[PDB]
């Protein structure tokens, strides 16, 4: 899963 490139990065 979670790669962190989306609109909710923070």
């Amino acid at each position: 899963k979670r790669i962190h490139i989306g609109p909710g990065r923070a």
Epitope: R2, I3, I5, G6, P7, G8
Partner: antibody, heavy 113, light 113 residues
């Protein structure tokens, strides 16, 4: 295990408003941020904006006056609304997960009289 | 509005050969590769976009090692060592460093059999 499904009218008259729905399955819409993307004929994508974990909405400047997002936890769906459409709004609309690693099949919309 | 200039538009290649796609941004998308949000997607005929490479060089899960990714500041290259028949489709670069998120024009990859 996540699934995305976009639905709406495949035909709209110029000047009317477009209303799309993105049915999310496999995880509640309140778990993260969701994406709205359109693809005009000729392979040309344009990021439309996003709905936050809290229902907030960011709109691509080229649309924020006609564009509008909303959500509904109970139906586990979030929506897109586009006002005064022109034949230039003709495209396949998509909703994808936060990190863009899962999109819906997309729904094609034709703006024509 | 970060402008993503993708070339070539059409890439004819023979099976087993090396394929290269280039993408250039009008703005710096970061300075580290772990801060540079430039990604590569592939769109097969009649399907949704599939994320193949994120953060310039990070290969997503389930993506073969034939797919490579590298870049710097504004220059990014996507490579496919041994082109196979299932690689057929259109490749897109896309950035999420700045709002609004913008895409490259796309590159249509075709096989020379």
């Amino acid at each position: 295990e996540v699934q995305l499904q976009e639905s709406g009218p495949s035909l709209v008259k110029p000047s009317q408003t477009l209303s799309l729905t993105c049915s999310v399955t496999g995880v509640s819409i309140t778990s993260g941020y969701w994406n709205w993307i359109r693809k005009f004929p000729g392979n040309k994508f344009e990021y439309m904006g996003y709905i936050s974990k809290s229902g907030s909405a960011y709109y691509n400047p080229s649309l924020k006056s006609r564009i509008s997002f909303t959500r509904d936890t109970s139906k586990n769906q979030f929506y897109l609304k586009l006002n005064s459409v022109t034949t230039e709004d003709t495209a396949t609309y998509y909703c994808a997960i936060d990190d863009f690693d899962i999109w819906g099949a997309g729904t094609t919309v034709t703006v024509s009289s | 509005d970060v402008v993503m200039t993708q070339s070539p538009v059409s890439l004819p290649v023979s099976l087993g050969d090396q394929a290269s796609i280039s993408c250039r941004s009008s703005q710096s998308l970061g300075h580290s590769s772990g801060n540079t949000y430039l990604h590569w997607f592939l769109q097969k005929p009649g399907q949704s976009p599939k994320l193949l490479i994120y953060k310039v060089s990070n290969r997503f899960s389930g993506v073969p090692d034939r797919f490579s990714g590298s870049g710097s500041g504004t220059d990014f290259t996507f490579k496919i060592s041994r082109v196979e028949a299932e690689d057929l489709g259109v490749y897109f670069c896309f950035q999420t460093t700045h709002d609004p998120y913008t895409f490259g024009g796309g590159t249509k990859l075709e096989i020379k059999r």
